[PDB]
Amino acid sequence: PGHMKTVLMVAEKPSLAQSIAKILSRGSLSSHKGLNGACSVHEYTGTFAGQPVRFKMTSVCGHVMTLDFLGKWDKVDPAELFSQAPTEKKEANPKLNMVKFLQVEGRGCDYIVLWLDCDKEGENICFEVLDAVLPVMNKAHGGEKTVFRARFSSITDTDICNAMACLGEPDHNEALSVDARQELDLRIGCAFTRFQTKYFQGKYGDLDSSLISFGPCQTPTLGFCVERHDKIQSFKPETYWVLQAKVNTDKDRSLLLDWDRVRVFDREIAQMFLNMTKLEKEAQVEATSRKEKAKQRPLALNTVEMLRVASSSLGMGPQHAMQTAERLYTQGYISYPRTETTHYPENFDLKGSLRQQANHPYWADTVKRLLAEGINRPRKGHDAGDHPPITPMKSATEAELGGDAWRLYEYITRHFIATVSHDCKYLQSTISFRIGPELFTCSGKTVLSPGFTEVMPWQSVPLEESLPTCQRGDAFPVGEVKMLEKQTNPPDYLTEAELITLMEKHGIGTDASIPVHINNICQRNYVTVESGRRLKPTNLGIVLVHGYYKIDAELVLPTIRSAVEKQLNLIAQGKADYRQVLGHTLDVFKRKFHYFVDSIAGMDELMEVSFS
Ligand SMILES: [Mg+2]
């Protein structure tokens, strides 16, 4: 043979590179600092393609490049930003000299193995890395297969070693989809925004025009929040009436009965119902029922659900939750937290994972019992073919993780244990009473077996007194018949969880970009985070959405954005053309831009009134 080949391997972050290399080298790792200070280099000897080679594992630091125009406060025509103005990739963090670092460590290498995180974003970074390293590689084995791509979902021995055993190739289609989204959002975003910042610059005393922006995704996202605001302001409470009766059992208990008609919105018919029941002194039992029912254990955890719970229960904003989750993934405590999958792959050792939790004080006894009783089969969920559900991959304590990391890990773990636990079994009981012509019911739940609600106590069935045993035909003295007059209540501002659900429902913010957009409209102070993590539109945010809507509703409605993202996903699947999707979309929004500029009065008028 000739010279021993050197295999360069690149992960997305320094910690990832170190951990992966430590696993693959079985601890025979030799590490030294790179030129940039951020990135280290991990070297060791091993085997590749049945041959002894030298391994050289390092990393980048997230995206190497960001898309920008070719060449701030300078005088350019926003209309030119659609087609004329050229765009080019620039280093996302120039001080790190990432391209130079890759060239230096990648020089003279024969093979490259890509260990970037496995999403479309990661595939895009693959070609960032390849663009830097390929020109500097050794030319010897230059006509061989020199580029490899590892696929993995967790930084664990099992998943990382298997990745090496079945190396694939980087997906250029998925990489192109990321590029296309970046270029679309940059051009369309800056065009509509820069026009307004200049147009309104110093125009009104109480308006800092630099606060105005448009985004093909962030604006519809804000649109949802402002829509709720509008519903709240225009809400008209309605009076309604509820008939309720109280009954005395044989064991001298007051049963509160629920009206079969539940409620009424007519004053006269309400008075009519009260009159025909208030004098009745006896309630006849017409029917009884006992039904064993199940409160199901949760579906396996996906990203969208994690974000809802982290917000609603843990008080973490979507971006805060994602970075916390990503850090957990980085240290190998959970699987990759960007997934739509709610279905456990068949190969996955669930009992093994459960066994890992058998020693934590909070659920050791619960887990041990489950291992003795035998694990339940998780519910069949959805397999999006991206990653497994977000699952604990390693045991942990609050000492190891710290505040935010532990709180998120505890939920992910408790949620997991529940998926492999049993359903909650309870008794649903009902009694039907006849009072005059009117029907009434009283209901009650009795827990038979807690099931998963032991490890998830917040989903437990509330303790209620068992309904009295009685027979059809039995009669109870009516203790009281009253009619409640009530008022319908307005909705509250959108919670982050509701917004997440809305964005998922309308198909915007796909590929886990939802937390970015939500954080964006918060960072721009278009909404404020109020108690219960509610998103209350600010004055400017309201004005902006109303302004955009008056000019062109399609700028605010998620319809257009949803279709674009579907087109972008088709690029990723190789079912749509990169350049054609770019061209068509940019044409559509260029047309809307010119209409926007012509109809700017729709925005200006609202701006004048609100900001003098
Ligand atoms: Mg990434």
Numbering used by the authors: -2 to 68, 72 to 612
Task: Copy out sentences from the published article reporting this entry, exactly as the authors wrote them.
The TOPO domain of TOP3β exhibits a toroidal-shaped structure, which is characteristic of the type IA topoisomerase. The TOPO domain is further divided into four subdomains (domains I–IV). The cavity formed by domains I, III and IV constitutes a Mg2+-bound catalytic pocket, where the catalytic residues are spatially arranged in a manner similar to those of other type IA topoisomerases. Previously reported E. coli TOP3 structures showed a transition from a closed conformation to an open conformation in the type IA enzyme upon binding of the substrate DNA39. Our substrate-free TOP3β structures adopted the closed conformation. Domain II of TOP3β appears more flexible than domains I, III and IV in the present TOP3β structures (one from the complex and two from the apo TOP3β in the asymmetric unit), indicative of its intrinsic flexibility for the induced fit binding to TDRD3. The R472Q mutation of TOP3β, which is located in domain II, has been found in schizophrenia patients. The R472Q mutation may hardly affect the tertiary structure of TOP3β, as the side chain of Arg472 is exposed to the solvent and partly disordered. However, the substrate-binding cavity of TOP3β is similar to that of TOP3α. We could find no TOP3α- or TOP3β-specific structural element that could determine their substrate preferences.
